[PDB]
């Protein structure tokens, strides 16, 4: 008998964010049965190589690998993942 | 007898982000019955190779590998994945 | 028995996103049986090589690979996945 | 018997981010019957190479790796995954 | 008879971050059966040879690596994975 309860009872404007999850049981990569990013929140990622395959530059391979993160870049971000009731959020930029 | 219950009683203007799952069990890359990105939020994502294949580049390959990011890139966002009841949210730029 | 309840009882102009998900059980990229992206926020997503396929560049290949991001690019978002009841949002450019 | 109860009474405006995982049980990488990623935020994220494959740079590979990160790049954030209820966030530039 | 109880009674405006986990039970990389990163916050990760796989570099390779980190980047965050209540946040730069 499982039994789950969430926010069974609810009032005065509440800012939530809900991840319930309920589970019952009775080759580069190889990943089962997995559960990934409810809230996942992903900035500036990067990723060059990955998952190149079987044999990769194999024989006789002259590679030159160059990576540049050189740029003016801003990221202001206000109340990331945070709820908030009766609140002020601003970003004044002047 | 598996029972969920979430958010039974609801009043009042509230903001809520639900992510309710319910399960019940009675070759570069390979993924199986698995669930993702239910709330993903991606912001400047870069992947450049990936899953190249089989024998990628295998045999008297000269290969130049050049990344630049070198871009004036602002990213100004006020509230994510944040609900908010009864609140200012506000972006002034000058 | 099997029961899942959401969001039973709502008054008072709630902001809600809800993302349910009931289940029951009695070659470069491989994937089965899965859910993604149910509530999923892309933004200046990059991607320059994928999935090639077999055999890419396999022999006597003189490959230059220039990836280049110097846009000048502003993203200006506000309440992204963020419902708000009651509320005030703004975005002001002067 | 298995009971789960989480915020069974909720007033007065709580701004809450909930996680609630419930489990019951009656090759470069692998990865199984795993949970990741609930409430997962990255920010200037690098990876360069990863999973490259079977036999990478086998025979007589002459590779140059540099990896430079010298971009000006500001991450000015307020309020990551910290609700705040009657409060004030404001991000002022001048 | 597993039984748990998680912010039974709530009242007052209460910012909470809550991760409740319930588990019962009657070759480069393996990991199994694993929770991960419910609150997880990554700030200018680097990861540049993972996972490379089978034979890397085998024989007869002259490979020069080279990992510069050498950027003006200010993190400026405030109240991170930090809930707060009738407080004040403010980010003020002149």
Not at 3 to 23: E, Q, T, W, Y
Not at 45 to 73: C, M, Q
Request: a negative charge; hydrophobic letters at 45%.
């Amino acid at each position: 008998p499982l039994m789950v309860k969430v926010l069974d009872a609810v009032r005065g404007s509440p800012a939530i964010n809900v991840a319930v999850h309920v589970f019952r049981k009775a080759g580069l990569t190889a990943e089962e049965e997995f559960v990934e990013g409810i809230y996942k929140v992903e900035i500036d990622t990067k990723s060059y190589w990955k998952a190149l395959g079987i044999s990769p530059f194999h024989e006789h391979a002259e590679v030159v690998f160059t990576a540049n993160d050189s740029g003016p870049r801003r990221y202001t971000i206000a109340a990331l993942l945070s709820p908030y009731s009766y609140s002020t959020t601003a970003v004044v930029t002047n």
